Every structure is written in C-alpha cells, then in structure tokens.
Design an enzyme around this catalytic site. Structure first.
Site, PDB file in Angstrom:
ATOM      1  CE1 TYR A  26      36.388 -21.904  11.708  1.00  0.00           C
ATOM      2  CE2 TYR A  26      35.471 -22.807   9.694  1.00  0.00           C
ATOM      3  CZ  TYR A  26      35.420 -22.001  10.629  1.00  0.00           C
ATOM      4  OH  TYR A  26      34.252 -21.149  10.935  1.00  0.00           O
ATOM      5  CG  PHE A  36      30.728 -24.707   4.339  1.00  0.00           C
ATOM      6  CD1 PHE A  36      31.131 -24.562   5.527  1.00  0.00           C
ATOM      7  CD2 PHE A  36      31.010 -25.909   3.505  1.00  0.00           C
ATOM      8  CE1 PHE A  36      31.859 -25.689   6.217  1.00  0.00           C
ATOM      9  CE2 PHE A  36      31.438 -27.007   4.587  1.00  0.00           C
ATOM     10  CZ  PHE A  36      32.005 -26.639   5.896  1.00  0.00           C
ATOM     11  CG  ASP A  37      32.858 -20.384   7.824  1.00  0.00           C
ATOM     12  OD1 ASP A  37      32.638 -20.613   9.002  1.00  0.00           O
ATOM     13  OD2 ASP A  37      33.358 -19.072   7.425  1.00  0.00           O
ATOM     14  CB  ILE A  56      30.773 -31.324  13.849  1.00  0.00           C
ATOM     15  CG1 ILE A  56      32.049 -30.339  13.146  1.00  0.00           C
ATOM     16  CG2 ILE A  56      29.496 -30.529  13.402  1.00  0.00           C
ATOM     17  CD1 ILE A  56      31.979 -30.830  11.458  1.00  0.00           C
ATOM     18  CE1 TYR A  82      26.794 -28.480  11.970  1.00  0.00           C
ATOM     19  CE2 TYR A  82      28.231 -29.204  10.248  1.00  0.00           C
ATOM     20  CZ  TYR A  82      27.838 -28.250  11.223  1.00  0.00           C
ATOM     21  OH  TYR A  82      28.866 -27.210  11.822  1.00  0.00           O
ATOM     22  CG  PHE A  99      36.561 -28.650   8.588  1.00  0.00           C
ATOM     23  CD1 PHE A  99      35.333 -29.466   8.399  1.00  0.00           C
ATOM     24  CD2 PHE A  99      36.056 -27.227   8.835  1.00  0.00           C
ATOM     25  CE1 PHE A  99      33.956 -29.004   8.478  1.00  0.00           C
ATOM     26  CE2 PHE A  99      34.721 -26.907   9.065  1.00  0.00           C
ATOM     27  CZ  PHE A  99      33.599 -27.822   8.943  1.00  0.00           C
TER      28      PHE A  99
HETATM   29  C1  LIG Z   1      28.698 -17.079  12.123  1.00  0.00           C
HETATM   30  O1  LIG Z   1      29.680 -18.342  12.222  1.00  0.00           O
HETATM   31  C2  LIG Z   1      29.179 -19.202  13.259  1.00  0.00           C
HETATM   32  C3  LIG Z   1      29.678 -20.497  12.820  1.00  0.00           C
HETATM   33  C4  LIG Z   1      29.382 -21.429  11.480  1.00  0.00           C
HETATM   34  C5  LIG Z   1      28.268 -21.828  11.476  1.00  0.00           C
HETATM   35  C6  LIG Z   1      27.615 -22.788  10.040  1.00  0.00           C
HETATM   36  C7  LIG Z   1      29.185 -23.645   9.870  1.00  0.00           C
HETATM   37  C8  LIG Z   1      28.647 -24.257   8.295  1.00  0.00           C
HETATM   38  C9  LIG Z   1      30.234 -23.037   9.826  1.00  0.00           C
HETATM   39  O2  LIG Z   1      30.460 -22.118   8.722  1.00  0.00           O
HETATM   40  O3  LIG Z   1      30.474 -22.261  11.085  1.00  0.00           O
HETATM   41  C10 LIG Z   1      31.361 -23.951   9.927  1.00  0.00           C
HETATM   42  O4  LIG Z   1      32.372 -23.774   8.993  1.00  0.00           O
HETATM   43  C11 LIG Z   1      31.238 -25.188  10.824  1.00  0.00           C
HETATM   44  O5  LIG Z   1      30.692 -26.237  10.177  1.00  0.00           O
HETATM   45  N1  LIG Z   1      31.749 -25.151  11.882  1.00  0.00           N
HETATM   46  C12 LIG Z   1      32.611 -23.956  12.740  1.00  0.00           C
HETATM   47  C13 LIG Z   1      33.989 -24.305  12.986  1.00  0.00           C
HETATM   48  C14 LIG Z   1      34.000 -25.463  13.911  1.00  0.00           C
HETATM   49  C15 LIG Z   1      33.256 -26.720  13.277  1.00  0.00           C
HETATM   50  C16 LIG Z   1      31.845 -26.483  12.845  1.00  0.00           C
HETATM   51  C17 LIG Z   1      30.926 -26.331  13.968  1.00  0.00           C
HETATM   52  O6  LIG Z   1      31.045 -27.345  14.901  1.00  0.00           O
HETATM   53  O7  LIG Z   1      30.022 -25.216  14.060  1.00  0.00           O
HETATM   54  C18 LIG Z   1      29.280 -25.111  15.015  1.00  0.00           C
HETATM   55  C19 LIG Z   1      28.025 -25.748  14.857  1.00  0.00           C
HETATM   56  C20 LIG Z   1      27.072 -25.165  13.542  1.00  0.00           C
HETATM   57  C21 LIG Z   1      26.903 -26.230  15.767  1.00  0.00           C
HETATM   58  C22 LIG Z   1      27.415 -27.063  17.001  1.00  0.00           C
HETATM   59  C23 LIG Z   1      27.668 -28.411  16.428  1.00  0.00           C
HETATM   60  C24 LIG Z   1      28.191 -29.382  17.767  1.00  0.00           C
HETATM   61  C25 LIG Z   1      27.095 -29.507  18.842  1.00  0.00           C
HETATM   62  O8  LIG Z   1      27.471 -30.137  19.759  1.00  0.00           O
HETATM   63  C26 LIG Z   1      26.375 -27.943  19.167  1.00  0.00           C
HETATM   64  O9  LIG Z   1      25.090 -28.258  19.912  1.00  0.00           O
HETATM   65  C27 LIG Z   1      25.216 -27.346  20.750  1.00  0.00           C
HETATM   66  C28 LIG Z   1      26.117 -27.177  17.930  1.00  0.00           C
HETATM   67  C29 LIG Z   1      29.220 -23.863  15.572  1.00  0.00           C
HETATM   68  C30 LIG Z   1      30.104 -23.517  16.338  1.00  0.00           C
HETATM   69  O10 LIG Z   1      31.227 -23.733  16.293  1.00  0.00           O
HETATM   70  C31 LIG Z   1      29.696 -22.414  17.719  1.00  0.00           C
HETATM   71  C32 LIG Z   1      31.040 -21.501  17.856  1.00  0.00           C
HETATM   72  C33 LIG Z   1      29.258 -23.252  18.788  1.00  0.00           C
HETATM   73  C34 LIG Z   1      27.879 -23.528  18.949  1.00  0.00           C
HETATM   74  C35 LIG Z   1      26.994 -22.547  18.411  1.00  0.00           C
HETATM   75  C36 LIG Z   1      27.480 -24.328  20.156  1.00  0.00           C
HETATM   76  O11 LIG Z   1      28.833 -25.053  20.669  1.00  0.00           O
HETATM   77  C37 LIG Z   1      27.183 -23.554  21.444  1.00  0.00           C
HETATM   78  O12 LIG Z   1      26.539 -24.362  22.435  1.00  0.00           O
HETATM   79  C38 LIG Z   1      25.555 -23.787  23.095  1.00  0.00           C
HETATM   80  C39 LIG Z   1      28.202 -22.504  22.182  1.00  0.00           C
HETATM   81  O13 LIG Z   1      28.754 -23.133  23.028  1.00  0.00           O
HETATM   82  C40 LIG Z   1      28.470 -21.261  21.693  1.00  0.00           C
HETATM   83  C41 LIG Z   1      29.985 -21.033  21.902  1.00  0.00           C
HETATM   84  C42 LIG Z   1      27.654 -20.313  22.212  1.00  0.00           C
HETATM   85  C43 LIG Z   1      27.576 -18.821  21.551  1.00  0.00           C
HETATM   86  C44 LIG Z   1      26.451 -18.138  22.176  1.00  0.00           C
HETATM   87  C45 LIG Z   1      27.244 -19.233  20.059  1.00  0.00           C
HETATM   88  C46 LIG Z   1      28.082 -18.648  19.093  1.00  0.00           C
HETATM   89  C47 LIG Z   1      27.957 -19.182  17.846  1.00  0.00           C
HETATM   90  C48 LIG Z   1      28.849 -18.626  17.021  1.00  0.00           C
HETATM   91  C49 LIG Z   1      28.734 -18.980  15.755  1.00  0.00           C
HETATM   92  C50 LIG Z   1      29.705 -18.899  14.365  1.00  0.00           C
HETATM   93  C51 LIG Z   1      31.097 -18.458  14.812  1.00  0.00           C
END
Ligand SMILES: CO[C@H]1C[C@@H]2CC[C@@H](C)[C@@](O)(O2)C(=O)C(=O)N2CCCC[C@H]2C(=O)O[C@H]([C@H](C)C[C@@H]2CC[C@@H](O)[C@H](OC)C2)CC(=O)[C@H](C)/C=C(\C)[C@@H](O)[C@@H](OC)C(=O)[C@H](C)C[C@H](C)/C=C/C=C/C=C/1C
Length: 107
Positions: A26, A36-37, A56, A82, A99
């Site tokens: 992506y 942004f990513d 999301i 968001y 995206f």
């Molecule tokens: C450094 O890069 C970040 C991702 C960044 C954050 C900032 C954004 C601009 C962005 O650049 O991604 C981005 O491009 C974006 O908007 N994304 C990422 C690509 C998928 C779509 C979107 C998204 O949903 O991000 C997500 C968004 C920011 C937040 C979620 C949105 C949906 C909502 O339902 C969730 O509530 C829970 C929160 C971030 C993620 O894809 C990560 C993987 C998933 C989570 C954090 C949660 O699902 C969490 O729930 C407990 C989990 O099950 C995870 C796996 C548990 C472990 C410990 C956490 C891992 C974290 C990894 C973080 C990573 C790789």
C-alpha cells in the site's frame, strides 16, 4: 464509504474469506495531497487478518472486495477512516484518504 477503482485486475475469482490473512502493498496519501506511508518503498508487504477490526473500515472493505493480484485506488471517506478525531500527528480531522493497494496473496 470506500470507492474502489481498479489499477490492475485480479484473477476475478479469489477473494479474501473471513479470518484470512491478507498480504498487501500500500501507499497512503491525503486526498490531492501529502503521502504519509508506503510499504512499497521499504520493500515490506503489510499483513492483516480480515474480520478482526485490525485496520480502518475503508481498507478492510476495500481489500475484501478485491481478488488476488488486483491493484486498486481506494478513496476512503472520513467516516470509514479516522473520522472527526483523525490520527494524532499524521491524519487531520475529516480527512478523505487515498490508498493504492495491491492484494499480493492470501494466507
Ligand atoms: C508504524 O506503522 C504503524 C502503522 C501506521 C500508523 C499510522 C498510519 C497513518 C499508517 O501510516 O500506518 C497508515 O498508512 C494507515 O493509515 N494504515 C496502515 C495500513 C492499513 C490501513 C491503516 C490502518 O488501519 O492503520 C492502523 C490504525 C492507525 C489504527 C487502527 C484502525 C482500526 C481500528 O479498529 C483499530 O482499533 C483497535 C486501530 C494501524 C494498524 O494497521 C496496526 C497494524 C493495527 C493496530 C494498531 C490495531 O488493529 C491493534 O488492535 C489492538 C492490533 O491488532 C495490532 C496488530 C497489535 C500490535 C501490538 C500493534 C501493531 C502496530 C503497528 C503499527 C504500524 C505498522
């Protein structure tokens, strides 16, 4: 909520099932604005499991309607992204997101 426009077609048959791990590339940007990513620039595919609220709503539902090999432009409205809160420091309130997503494989 999420509009999907095909960049490259998939096989047209193999779609993600509930609880399957989707492997994608992506690139994300604000609509008509800043990138942004990107998983492509770091050469590392992004993995998430469908039906677990991991990503999301716009991305989840975008990938869910794509077949294996498909690449698409996903235009995601704020309510499927968001919302009024935004993502602190990166995504402003009420941001429409774009995206470019490729569904590489299902596992
Ligand atoms: C450094 O890069 C970040 C991702 C960044 C954050 C900032 C954004 C601009 C962005 O650049 O991604 C981005 O491009 C974006 O908007 N994304 C990422 C690509 C998928 C779509 C979107 C998204 O949903 O991000 C997500 C968004 C920011 C937040 C979620 C949105 C949906 C909502 O339902 C969730 O509530 C829970 C929160 C971030 C993620 O894809 C990560 C993987 C998933 C989570 C954090 C949660 O699902 C969490 O729930 C407990 C989990 O099950 C995870 C796996 C548990 C472990 C410990 C956490 C891992 C974290 C990894 C973080 C990573 C790789």
């Amino acid at each position: 909520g999420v509009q999907v426009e095909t960049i490259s077609p998939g096989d047209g048959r193999t779609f993600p099932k509930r609880g399957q791990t989707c492997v994608v590339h992506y690139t994300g940007m604000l609509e008509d604005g800043k990138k942004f990513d990107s998983s492509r620039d770091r050469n590392k595919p992004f993995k998430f499991m469908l039906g677990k609220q991991e990503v999301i709503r716009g991305l989840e539902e975008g990938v869910a309607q794509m077949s294996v090999g498909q690449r698409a432009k996903l235009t995601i409205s704020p309510d499927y992204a968001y919302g009024a809160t935004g993502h602190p420091g990166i995504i402003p309130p009420h941001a429409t997101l774009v995206f470019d997503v490729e569904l590489l494989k299902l596992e």
